[PDB]
Amino acid sequence: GXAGA
């Protein structure tokens, strides 16, 4: 759900 995924 967060960035960098």
Epitope: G1, X2, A3, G4, A5
Partner: antibody
């Protein structure tokens, strides 16, 4: 219950390095991304870097050249290393899932690192 | 880099006052959604009150509420109570599919007028 226990910290000579770790209790460190954050005495909060849940570390530009954030899935810890420290790195250091867009948030208790001869 | 700004930096208010604290990010936050509001009192660690712009965490008084979109966000305290004088921080998440950052605002200190 659920906890994030922070350890390390203390005195660092200028040019030296700090090593801080947080041990998760009641959940798995692999499950979430964790930040490191600091607060110099009487100043505001400052982001250092982030280790995604996938295990990739990104850093604030000011911290990238000196900082390494890793995790140990076996011991359930996340760790911050910073080298080449200077006086202005004196601060309370926190590990935290900041919870900006998700319901889970948790912080370590904070520990003081003083950089001085 | 990424930068966030709160207005005002310092606020004097009375109990019962309506309080509004704004926060502007230098670029849109992750999914236009990843902003939280924290409360910090002297000698204490930061406590999170709101997340995902407008969601309140269990146990957080309903007088606190959050709004905004994209680059602009607002913390509202409908009726300031004695336990609410503290410093408030907005905190945003940013990045790409191979990028991830966070930034804090500078903090807004809410003190009691007399």
């Amino acid at each position: 219950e659920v906890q994030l226990v922070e350890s390390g910290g203390g005195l660092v000579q200028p040019g030296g390095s700090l090593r801080l770790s947080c041990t998760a209790s009641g959940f798995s460190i692999d499950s979430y991304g964790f930040s490191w954050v600091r607060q110099a005495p009487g100043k505001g909060l400052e982001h250092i870097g982030y280790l995604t849940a996938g295990g990739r570390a990104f850093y604030a530009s000011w911290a990238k050249s000196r900082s390494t954030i890793t995790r140990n899935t076996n011991e359930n810890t996340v760790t911050l290393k910073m080298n080449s420290l200077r006086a202005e790195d004196t601060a309370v250091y926190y590990c935290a899932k900041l919870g900006t867009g998700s319901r889970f948030a948790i912080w370590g208790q904070g520990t003081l690192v003083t950089v001085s001869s | 880099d990424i930068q966030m700004t709160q207005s005002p930096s310092s606020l004097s208010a009375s109990v019962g006052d309506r309080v509004t604290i704004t926060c502007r990010a230098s670029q849109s936050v992750w999914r236009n959604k990843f902003v939280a509001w924290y409360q910090q009192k002297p000698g204490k660690a930061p406590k999170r009150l709101i997340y995902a712009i407008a969601s309140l965490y269990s146990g957080v008084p309903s007088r606190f509420s959050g709004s905004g979109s994209g680059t602009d966000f607002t913390l509202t305290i409908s009726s300031l109570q004695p336990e609410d004088f503290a410093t408030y921080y907005c905190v945003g998440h940013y990045g790409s599919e191979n990028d991830a950052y966070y930034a804090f605002g500078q903090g807004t200190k809410v003190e009691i007028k007399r």
